[PDB]
Design a protein around this ligand. Structure first.
Ligand SMILES: Nc1ncnc2c1ncn2[C@@H]1O[C@H](COP(=O)(O)OP(=O)(O)O)[C@@H](O)[C@H]1O
Ligand SMILES: Nc1ncnc2c1ncn2[C@@H]1O[C@H](COP(=O)(O)OP(=O)(O)O)[C@@H](O)[C@H]1O
Ligand SMILES: [Cl-]
Ligand SMILES: [Zn+2]
Ligand SMILES: [Zn+2]
Lengths: 69, 69
């Protein structure tokens, strides 16, 4: 089943690349209708980046959650 | 740059999972407007599957080619 290839990929994509900033925590994310938005940082490091004034790691990658578009 | 995280992922996704049927050739694919469609089989095994009457591996996974949806 093709939807499961996509789901297992997202599961892996999410797991093997932690927060770009602290490198250990997993990334923040949310579901935005038909896509999964994976933010570049965990929530702790994102808030911290505002405080310290660094917007270098700000960003996200959206992933279609289904196999067919 | 976020578009590049998506591109490098697709590059990897495409490379580490060859044809589901013969297991060596890389998969067929095409660009369908804003998505990359990765078919489950290379072209040789897909045509062959019609000939032998097996539709078990028929299918594809579409991937949004950009970071933002
Ligand atoms: N945890 C995070 N790590 C990195 N960047 C983030 C994080 N949370 C938000 N951002 C960035 O801040 C902005 C807010 O995004 P978001 O709230 O998803 O947009 P929208 O409100 O349109 O859904 C975007 O640039 C997003 O990439
Ligand atoms: N190389 C291949 N491997 C596996 N399945 C395939 C392959 N080529 C086509 N198919 C399947 O046959 C059908 C034809 O798909 P496609 O021509 O992409 O649709 P469309 O013409 O709407 O763009 C779909 O079920 C597709 O998944
Ligand atoms: Cl996707
Ligand atoms: Zn972090
Ligand atoms: Zn093959």
């Amino acid at each position: 089943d093709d939807d499961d290839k996509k789901t297992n990929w997202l599961k892996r994509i999410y797991r093997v690349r932690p927060c770009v900033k602290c490198k250990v925590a997993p990334r923040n994310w949310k579901v935005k209708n038909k896509h999964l938005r994976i933010y570049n940082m965990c929530k702790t490091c994102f808030n911290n980046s505002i405080d310290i004034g660094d917007d270098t790691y700000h960003g996200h990658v959206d992933w279609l959650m289904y196999a067919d578009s």
